[PDB]
Structure formats: structure tokens, C-alpha cells
Symmetry: C2
């Protein structure tokens, strides 16, 4: 409760900032995405309020980079959405508000929803996901492999992408179990027309394993830790010049 | 009029339960390589009663453990009978449906050991089918039973697959040799693109994890070919054979031997 207290005060006082972790096209090395991650610089209502802020902040940041000629047309940014945000009407409203104020092209925004959303899959959740899809926003399943999936729902739901959990990526290719989980996820995604981001790439062996198996995308401290907006935009600049 | 519980207890003491067996076929050859044991109640008052009509009541009162143990023993005894008669080939196994309630107190380990000891059946000839949603109730006790059974050489498959929830990390870590695609999906392929996609997804999962697949509910030649062409190893369904009384099943084994 003391932790929620601190976050509330941080929100009230505007003491939060987004950092962004580059998401790279493994074959080219091109930064094509970035996961927005909340940092503090020193209750469902709190989740909702934080997400409203994150959504607007992230969409505004990308729109700003586009207008300054720093973000290429292929750059998208991703925001993490809690399963707890599907209660009521608020998520679709928050996304609509962020897009309206920023003027951002909706397919520039991607929402990362943890796998265990499938465990709370009600009619209201399915309807929310369809509503979000109808707006042109990209949807990804996050932490994939660590939660629970219905193979029927996975085959039906409008997710364009999956993110392989870091806990598996960090153990390949040495460990058979984690390695077969990763290669299975890649095969699933291929048949479902989903793109895959491998989260938590730490070593060059991991990068190379993943690339040589058609894993589209990667993110990890190997390439870049989460970066402040200005540091992230520097990477975009160097890439544009290259 | 007696309660269903009273009548079920009487069915056990009066030997009114029976097993039927549905052939499991290797798609590539058309060979019967297995059989799923399926309990019925030969109810003197009603005829051949299906488990949907009594198993829920068994579960309400915990009679399900005694009932499932009866099934396990009867199945092991039957396979041993066919083996001794020379009618069951060396590759033949039979599969028994297990209730998640059997894991309680690690009962299942003792129940399987008893069934094997009473029948003399080798563990490598017995397969167990546990519903996919066992993954939502995965405790150290369940994991202990599963590891014990794999250690014995008893093969383990996930039943009703696609109608429940799976953890990819559990599918990898747990000793499941196979899964069985639910008939509700297979029944509708390729005509219904949604069900067809579900089947394709499950096949990719199983192949990825080195698991064998039985597609249940195969009703048409087109479905048989769809699955076979996509490397699904085994099948079960009305196209090949409905569930059969023991003597009927054994006759199928006799025909195949020729
Ligand atoms: Cl049964
Ligand atoms: Cl039934
Ligand atoms: Cl023997
Ligand atoms: Mg994320
Ligand atoms: Mg995770
Ligand atoms: Mg079964």
C-alpha cells in the first residue's frame, strides 16, 4: 500500500518519465520499435491513471520525433497494458484520447498485453480487443510462454505479435527446454501470421540463434538498455545518417 | 427410488460397469496401435449408460476415485488377457482416462502400481489421458505423480486438447508424451477456417515440443488426409471405428493380424 502511495504521489506531481528500449530488426540491425517503460525520478484507479498518462506521453513523443524528422515512417512504439484495464470502457477511451491529442497514425502504436489475459477472457474482454483492433492499433502478447494460453483463443484473437519472455531467451541455445520453447513459439507465430520479438537478448550467440531461425525482432541489453527520450532519439539520428 | 450415488455404489459391488474401447490408428499405415478405454454402466434398469450420465455424480461424492481405479484395473486386465490369447500384438497399448481427483494424496501412483501388479501388465503397455486443465491445478503432488509415472514407463497424454489452457513452460518441463486434439475442432475441419486454424496451431505446438498427436473425432476421409498430410501421427474417430465392446475390439485385432 506504501508502494502504491509513492506511485500516486509521483503521478500527481508529474515525477514520472518514459524510457524506451529499442526493438531491432534482427537481420538488418535496424531500430524499428521501442518499448515504453515507466521510470520514477525522485488500486485499479492508479493503474488506469498511470496508463492514461503513458499512452498520451508515448504517442506524443513519437509524433514529436516524426515532426522533427527523426523518426522514420516505419518506427512504432509499444505500451504495456495490464489485464486489469479491461474492466469497463476506459482502455478504448484512453487509447482514443491519446491518438486524438497526439495526431499519431494509429498503427504507430502497439499495446503489449500479458499472456494471462487468456485466463480472464470474457465477452467484454473479446469485445475490447476487437474495438482496439478496429482503431488500427497493433496488439501483442507479452511475456509469452510464462503465462497460460488457450490454443483455441490464440488461433482466433486479433494479436498481430508475440514477445518471447526473457526467461527463455537468456537460456538458449545451451538449455534444451528453453530452446525448444523458443523454436516452438517461432513456429506457432509463423502459422498465425504473427511477428515475434525476442525479449532479453544478452549475448551474441542468442542474437545469432534467433536471427538464423527467422525471429523477426529482438530487444535486449546486448543492443541497448532502456533509454531516455533524448538518448533514444540519438540512436534514430545515427541510423538515419548511416 | 434410490439415489444415483446408492445405485453407483451398487453398480461397483455388482460388477455392472463395462469398458468399451475405441481404436487409435496410426494414420500413415492405417494400423490399430492403441485403444482408448471408455467406461459405461450396463444398468439393468436402462441399458448401456454413458459416463456423461453418471461421472458428474461420482465426482460430487468422491466415488470417482473408486470408479477410476476400477477402470484402470479392468483396462490392464483386458490388455493382459488379449496378450495371453495372442491377439494383442507387441505394439498394442491401451489408454485410460484419469480424473484430476486421482492425484490427491498421490493416490494415482498407488492405483497404477496396483493395476499393473494385479494384471501383470508391463507399464510400457499402459497410457494415461489427463485433461488439459490439469495445468491450471499443477501442484507438487501432481508433479510428483507425473514424474513417478514417467519413471515407471507409463506414457502420459493431455486430453481434450485446445478446450483448456496450457503453459508452454509446463508443456516443455512436464513428462507428457502426447496430446489428443479435441473432437470439437477436428469435426469441423477444413470447412470451418477457425477450427481448421486451431488444429494447425495445435499440430505446430506438438511438433515443436516433440509430442505425439492423436486427432480425435475423425469423421471424413478429407479430415484423415488433412491430418496425415500434416504429420499428425495418430487418429481416433467414427470414420475408422466407434467405441467397441471388448469382443468386438478383439475381432478388429484378429482381422488386422491377417
Ligand atoms: Cl472413461
Ligand atoms: Cl459420454
Ligand atoms: Cl508381458
Ligand atoms: Mg512489455
Ligand atoms: Mg515476463
Ligand atoms: Mg480420453
Amino acid at each position: 500500500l506504501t508502494l502504491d502511495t509513492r506511485l500516486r504521489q509521483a503521478l500527481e506531481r508529474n515525477e514520472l518519465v518514459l524510457h524506451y528500449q529499442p526493438i531491432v530488426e534482427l537481420a538488418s540491425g535496424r531500430i524499428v520499435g521501442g518499448e515504453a517503460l515507466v521510470r520514477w525520478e525522485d488500486d485499479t484507479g492508479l493503474i488506469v491513471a498511470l496508463s492514461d498518462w503513458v499512452l498520451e506521453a508515448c504517442c506524443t513523443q513519437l509524433r514529436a520525433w516524426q515532426q522533427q524528422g527523426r523518426a522514420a515512417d516505419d518506427l512504432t512504439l509499444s505500451v504495456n497494458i495490464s489485464t486489469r484495464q479491461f474492466e469497463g470502457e476506459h482502455l478504448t477511451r484512453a487509447v482514443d484520447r491519446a491518438l486524438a491529442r497526439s495526431g499519431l497514425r494509429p498503427d504507430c502504436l502497439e499495446l503489449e498485453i500479458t499472456e494471462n489475459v487468456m485466463l480472464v477472457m470474457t465477452d467484454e474482454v473479446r469485445t475490447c480487443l476487437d474495438a482496439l483492433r478496429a482503431r488500427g492499433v497493433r496488439l501483442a502478447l507479452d511475456d509469452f510462454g510464462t503465462g497460460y494460453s488457450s490454443l483455441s483463443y490464440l488461433s482466433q484473437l486479433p494479436f498481430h505479435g508475440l514477445k518471447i519472455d526473457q526467461s527463455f531467451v537468456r537460456k538458449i541455445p545451451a538449455h534444451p527446454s528453453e530452446t525448444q520453447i523458443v523454436t516452438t513459439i517461432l513456429a506457432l507465430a509463423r502459422g498465425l501470421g504473427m511477428e515475434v520479438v525476442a525479449e532479453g537478448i544478452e549475448t551474441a550467440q542468442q542474437y545469432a540463434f534467433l536471427r538464423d531461425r527467422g525471429c523477426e525482432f529482438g530487444q535486449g541489453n546486448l543492443m541497448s538498455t532502456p533509454q531516455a527520450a533524448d538518448a533514444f532519439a540519438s540512436l534514430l539520428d545515427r541510423q538515419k545518417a548511416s
